[PDB]
Amino acid sequence: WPPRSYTCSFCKREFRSAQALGGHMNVHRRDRARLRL
Ligand SMILES: [Cd+2]
Numbered sequence: 001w002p003p004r005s006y007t008c009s010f011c012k013r014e015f016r017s018a019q020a021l022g023g024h025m026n027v028h029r030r031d032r033a034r035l036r037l
Contacts, residue, residue, distance in 0.1 A: 002014065004016065006018065006021050007021075008021055008024055008025045008028070009025070010025060010028045011024075011028075
């Protein structure tokens with residue numbers, strides 16, 4: 001978890017937001033889409 005960027009844990013993806021991550025983590029629910037992993 002860097003200063004100018006944060007992780008969702010579930011997508012282990014670094015983002016440049018705060019509230020967008022909180023919301024983006026709550027949007028998590030299965031894959032149900034493409035993407036190899
Ligand atoms: Cd996420």
